[PDB]
Amino acid sequence: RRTLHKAIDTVRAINKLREGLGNVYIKADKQKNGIKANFKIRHNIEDGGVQLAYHYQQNTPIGDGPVLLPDNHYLSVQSKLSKDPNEKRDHMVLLEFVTAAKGEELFTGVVPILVELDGDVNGHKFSVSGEGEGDATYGKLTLKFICTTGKLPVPWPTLVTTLVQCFSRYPDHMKQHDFFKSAMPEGYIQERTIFFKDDGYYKTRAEVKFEGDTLVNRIELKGIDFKEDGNILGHKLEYDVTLMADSLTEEQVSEYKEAFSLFDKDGDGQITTKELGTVMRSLDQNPSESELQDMINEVDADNNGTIDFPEFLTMMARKMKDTDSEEEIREACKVFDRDNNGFISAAELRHVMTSIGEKLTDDEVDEMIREADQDGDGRIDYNEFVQLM
Ligand SMILES: [Ca+2]
Ligand SMILES: [Ca+2]
Ligand SMILES: [Ca+2]
Ligand SMILES: [Ca+2]
């Protein structure tokens, strides 16, 4: 019958922009005079499930020169994997939008990118070449990769992380922490272990430095102890437009559009800083304009200063156990149980719906309460609430 979903999906959309969308944690490695980093990637498998890829990373400077040593922060990447319809070689088209929350001078403007990788995965050797450009200023990368040794023995999505964090847009306010540009042009060495759960592991040594106009990324990859018809060598992973981002049912994309339109009250198909701010205000939270722009900048890939529904879907569809799709809907309870008594009342349920921009009769408040209320009491409890997933 009922979609309170739009109300919850509305609150949900606010907690995600606030909590913030960044998936790659960067700690400094004083000792090795560079950076360390750990992160998961959840590759979707055809016929159900996700193939976990545990990432371990250390980058150290090549150059003798000085180098910036950061406080703990996050990088957020959104990826968009494609095929070139004309291209008939094994290839991948990557588009990336990457942001964080002396060598800087080199990344102002549009630098072209060469990428070159040598793999040995259970003695299945292969090479990949990369052409394209990076605009660090807007955090955008374009790249086309080609397997120059025939058919790639591993799925392209598993090579994405291995195939240039010096293109991450570090906002001016944080320019102090951009280790990767600071390292250039001498460059940096980026070493990783990538552990594929219940399967083998990649071992990468890459060096990232300028050769003239172009930022070059050169990679030896060794792939050890892989199950030979497991998910990697056995090619069992959905290509997926995104790395690290999921699908949604017809029922979810509808409710999400409905929630989107509670922010986008003018119907221009765009949420502005003011549009977002009114809704937040409505639910007794008064963010600053500066926070509102930071919040939008998170999902504003095309740098037009507004969230369109596509940008909103991508945020709402972030992976599955980002932390837990539960922890998140438990975090919604707070907003709805305004008195804090441990229950969301018909009164409270009204107050919210009203605030967010739902017109409703008092016979419809009552319907939602009964629709949600397993225990008979005329109140939704935090379990009753998360139950109505
Ligand atoms: Ca609008
Ligand atoms: Ca936009
Ligand atoms: Ca209450
Ligand atoms: Ca109840």
Side-chain angles (χ1 to χ4, degrees), residues 260 263-272 275 306-307:
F260 174 93
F263 297 100
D264 181 35
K265 304 223 220 261
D266 62 42
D268 60 11
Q270 309 281 325
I271 308 169
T272 67
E275 273 177 315
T306 58
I307 315 180

Side-chain angles (χ1 to χ4, degrees), residues 33-35 37 39-46 48-101 103 106-174 176-185 187-273 275-295:
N33 226 227
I35 321 295
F39 55 98
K40 289 177 179 198
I41 292 285
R42 316 203 187 253
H43 297 301
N44 310 255
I45 320 190
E46 69 203 8
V50 309
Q51 170 55 68
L52 250 311
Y54 313 110
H55 281 62
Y56 296 96
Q57 189 187 337
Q58 6 145 223
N59 309 42
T60 73
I62 293 165
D64 273 314
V67 107
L68 277 142
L69 260 289
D71 292 323
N72 294 173
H73 61 293
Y74 279 103
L75 301 183
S76 208
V77 348
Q78 306 191 331
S79 304
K80 234 128 39 42
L81 287 117
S82 335
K83 301 303 198 150
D84 177 344
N86 293 345
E87 180 63 54
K88 303 264 152 177
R89 284 163 307 195
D90 214 346
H91 73 283
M92 158 175 71
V93 157
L94 203 59
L95 262 296
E96 298 207 321
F97 164 67
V98 214
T99 55
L106 295 222
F107 289 89
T108 69
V110 185
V111 5
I113 302 170
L114 233 193
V115 179
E116 232 82 56
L117 169 150
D118 284 341
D120 185 302
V121 183
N122 290 2
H124 300 296
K125 301 181 203 262
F126 68 87
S127 309
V128 172
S129 66
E131 214 156 27
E133 17 176 291
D135 206 332
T137 314
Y138 304 88
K140 78 163 137 69
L141 285 127
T142 318
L143 289 153
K144 179 196 186 155
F145 305 94
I146 298 147
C147 181
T148 59
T149 66
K151 145 113 292 182
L152 193 69
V154 304
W156 282 110
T158 73
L159 284 194
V160 164
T161 62
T162 313
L163 298 170
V164 290
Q165 289 171 311
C166 47
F167 286 103
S168 291
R169 182 165 56 71
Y170 274 85
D172 288 15
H173 347 310
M174 255 175 38
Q176 295 195 317
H177 301 342
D178 186 356
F179 165 80
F180 311 88
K181 291 172 188 52
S182 79
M184 312 293 306
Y188 60 75
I189 304 105
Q190 184 181 304
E191 300 200 322
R192 282 200 182 115
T193 298
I194 297 172
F195 283 100
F196 297 88
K197 190 152 109 184
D198 311 349
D199 206 321
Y201 60 98
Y202 297 154
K203 252 278 163 208
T204 75
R205 180 174 209 269
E207 75 173 307
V208 178
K209 95 291 211 90
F210 274 88
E211 310 172 353
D213 270 7
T214 119
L215 183 284
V216 176
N217 180 21
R218 282 192 201 287
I219 313 150
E220 308 288 28
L221 184 156
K222 228 210 290 177
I224 282 159
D225 185 52
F226 279 87
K227 291 171 191 193
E228 192 65 52
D229 104 304
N231 301 330
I232 280 57
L233 289 171
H235 282 287
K236 299 206 210 311
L237 308 171
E238 290 171 23
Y239 193 62
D240 286 346
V241 146
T242 97
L243 207 100
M244 204 258 329
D246 226 304
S247 30
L248 299 169
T249 193
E250 258 284 357
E251 192 70 297
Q252 273 195 309
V253 175
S254 192
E255 279 147 21
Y256 286 177
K257 174 100 273 300
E258 215 62 10
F260 174 93
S261 79
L262 278 173
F263 297 100
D264 181 35
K265 304 223 220 261
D266 62 42
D268 60 11
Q270 309 281 325
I271 308 169
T272 67
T273 67
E275 273 177 315
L276 173 53
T278 88
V279 177
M280 291 188 56
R281 214 86 121 191
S282 140
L283 300 173
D284 298 309
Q285 29 188 314
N286 303 35
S288 95
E289 175 128 70
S290 316
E291 298 160 2
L292 264 17
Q293 203 80 52
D294 288 345
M295 287 191 185

